[PDB]
Amino acid sequence: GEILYRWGLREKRAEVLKFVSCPPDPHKGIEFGVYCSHCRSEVRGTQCAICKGFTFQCAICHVAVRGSSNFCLTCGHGGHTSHMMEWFRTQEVCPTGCGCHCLLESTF
Amino acid sequence: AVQGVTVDPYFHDRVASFYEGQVAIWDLRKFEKPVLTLTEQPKPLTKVAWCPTRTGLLATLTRDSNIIRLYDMQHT
Amino acid sequence: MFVARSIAADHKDLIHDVSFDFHGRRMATCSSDQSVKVWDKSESGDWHCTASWKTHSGSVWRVTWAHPEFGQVLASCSFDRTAAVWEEIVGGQSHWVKRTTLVDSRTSVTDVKFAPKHMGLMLATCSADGIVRIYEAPDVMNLSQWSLQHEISCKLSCSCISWNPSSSRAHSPMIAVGSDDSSPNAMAKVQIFEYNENTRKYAKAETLMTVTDPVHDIAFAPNLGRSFHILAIATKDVRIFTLKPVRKELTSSGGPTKFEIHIVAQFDNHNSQVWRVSWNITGTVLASSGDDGCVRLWKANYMDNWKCTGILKGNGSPV
Amino acid sequence: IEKLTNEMKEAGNLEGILLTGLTKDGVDLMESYVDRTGDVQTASYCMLQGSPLDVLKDERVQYWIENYRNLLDAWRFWHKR
Ligand SMILES: [Zn+2]
Ligand SMILES: [Zn+2]
Ligand SMILES: [Zn+2]
Ligand SMILES: [Zn+2]
Numbered sequence A: 001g002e003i004l005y006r007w008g009l010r011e012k013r014a015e016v017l018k019f020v021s022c023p024p025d026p027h028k029g030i031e032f033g034v035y036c037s038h039c040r041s042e043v044r045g046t047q048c049a050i051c052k053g054f055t056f057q058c059a060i061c062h063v064a065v066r067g068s069s070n071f072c073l074t075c076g077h078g079g080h081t082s083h084m085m086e087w088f089r090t091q092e093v094c095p096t097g098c099g100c101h102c103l104l105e106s107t108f
Numbered sequence B: 001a002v003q004g005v006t007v008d009p010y011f012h013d014r015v016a017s018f019y020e021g022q023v024a025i026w027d028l029r030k031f032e033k034p035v036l037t038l039t040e041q042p043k044p045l046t047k048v049a050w051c052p053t054r055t056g057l058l059a060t061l062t063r064d065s066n067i068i069r070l071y072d073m074q075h076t
Numbered sequence C: 001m002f003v004a005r006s007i008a009a010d011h012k013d014l015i016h017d018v019s020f021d022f023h024g025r026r027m028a029t030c031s032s033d034q035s036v037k038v039w040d041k042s043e044s045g046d047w048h049c050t051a052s053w054k055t056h057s058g059s060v061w062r063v064t065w066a067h068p069e070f071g072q073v074l075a076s077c078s079f080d081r082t083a084a085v086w087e088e089i090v091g092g093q094s095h096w097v098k099r100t101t102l103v104d105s106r107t108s109v110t111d112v113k114f115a116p117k118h119m120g121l122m123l124a125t126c127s128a129d130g131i132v133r134i135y136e137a138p139d140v141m142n143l144s145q146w147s148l149q150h151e152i153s154c155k156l157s158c159s160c161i162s163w164n165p166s167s168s169r170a171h172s173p174m175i176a177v178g179s180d181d182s183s184p185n186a187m188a189k190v191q192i193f194e195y196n197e198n199t200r201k202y203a204k205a206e207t208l209m210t211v212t213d214p215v216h217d218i219a220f221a222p223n224l225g226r227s228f229h230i231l232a233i234a235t236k237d238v239r240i241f242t243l244k245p246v247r248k249e250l251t252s253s254g255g256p257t258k259f260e261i262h263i264v265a266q267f268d269n270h271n272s273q274v275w276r277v278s279w280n281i282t283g284t285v286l287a288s289s290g291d292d293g294c295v296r297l298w299k300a301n302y303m304d305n306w307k308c309t310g311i312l313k314g315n316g317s318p319v
Numbered sequence D: 001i002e003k004l005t006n007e008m009k010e011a012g013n014l015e016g017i018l019l020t021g022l023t024k025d026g027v028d029l030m031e032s033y034v035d036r037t038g039d040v041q042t043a044s045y046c047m048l049q050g051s052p053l054d055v056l057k058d059e060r061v062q063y064w065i066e067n068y069r070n071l072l073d074a075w076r077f078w079h080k081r
Helices: A002-007 A011-017 A081-090 A102-106 D002-011 D014-020 D024-037 D041-047 D059-073
Strands: A069-071 A078-080 B003-007 B014-019 B022-027 B045-050 B057-062 B069-072 C015-020 C026-031 C035-041 C047-054 C060-065 C073-078 C083-090 C094-102 C109-114 C122-127 C131-136 C147-153 C158-163 C174-179 C190-196 C201-208 C217-220 C229-234 C238-245 C259-267 C274-279 C285-290 C294-299 C307-313
Touching (some): A002 A011, A069 A081, B014 B045, C026 C060, C035 C060, C047 C094, C060 C109, C109 C158, C122 C158, C158 C217, C174 C229, C201 C259, C217 C274, C238 C285, D002 D024, D024 D041, D024 D059, D041 D059
Antiparallel strands (some): B045 B057, C015 C026, C026 C035, C035 C047, C060 C073, C073 C083, C158 C174, C174 C190, C190 C201, C217 C229, C229 C238, C274 C285, C294 C307
């Protein structure tokens, strides 16, 4: 896998490493939590522990988000990966009206 | 009730009878007491017939009536 | 000004009930062979089936969708005194899996409906014995658990129920239940129950005295920010009623709110027992279907008067 | 002026806004217009034009805006929303 990575091929490295018996350790450091859309409490998960509802809702489709997502660290808004990609393909303002130029405040 | 004995084409074990304005249904496998009794009509009944093209449908017509009463026995 | 066309969909048995999703891209159909089918519309605009299975031992009467915010959830009522909840799981061929079943009814479950989205994930079931049961799922992430929240006795054979789609902060939840009893006595057939926050219990608010014929369908219209509520009743003649709440005195807040009932339209063009009534999204067009094999579309006019706007036939031949 | 304004408010014609202005009376007139017509898009757009904060604080205007947003969502016009 290290040789493959040195060669510049990355996908093959992941494919090979998927066959390792020993799993690695999780990242110890900064993590992301989401404010519940109902109780506004700090919930570490896709489902609330108090309101038992979905905590993360897309800023475009307004549907519950369970898989891959993107958000602006400066503005705190985000949603579905494909939806936000389509939105930022042409537009440059935060789609929730916050006024943040999330591209310039996120692409560090 | 001994008048208008008839058997449902779809359910060979179901029979019907009517006396005056009261109608009863019987199950030949356990025909000791009527399985069910329909609501008694004021006017005496005149005809009772099962629908051959529809399962568990019975039709009744009474004396001097312009309306025919249909019953759906397909619940059980 | 309505034109019709035939959708190239193949069905082998008689279709009992059809229902749309929220976005109008998914359809659910119940057949006469205790079968349920799901159809999806492609980008080109064609419809293709995606799932099919048998659900209950008795006949299947009604099947309805839930709001997409809770996922893809369907609720089906059966003549076998059961009400099943189905959720779609895909791993991509769709694989619908039943998640829960309510069999608390002692008679055949006649109708099943979903509560409005702003009130959570609730469901209502009206049975033939005169019992309306309202259940709620405390956790939206666990579909297999449900609790019976409310139970109401109507003393008459329930035939149809309808929620109030109002989502305002000043309107308490409302549910209307009809009846199809054909007793010779002249009795009311429509009653309305309004939830009371002070008691956490639903209480009867108003009974439609003017309705004595058996009722087959009842439908609230979308609120859309109006100041009153619109109800449609299906009988030997289609009826439209308007309910306007009265100003509640600030001296004391008591029981159910008083309302003023006025009829605004009564059509008898079907000349038969009207079977189904439905509203559009905006609550401005009413669709009615009766025993005459015809579909009638009614709309208001410049003088705020109700008149027929479309007539069609079951075969699709225009009139 | 008073009589004509009262008549227009009880009538529901948008032309009476010139008399009432963007105040509570204008809100009542818009409510009557919606009751007759059901158009929420026009009411939403008009109520946003330089209306004072207290005027914008009414529940009815917020409800109309939310209904318009929900309708737009039900049409997949997300970018418009
Ligand atoms: Zn919560
Ligand atoms: Zn931002
Ligand atoms: Zn933002
Ligand atoms: Zn999204």
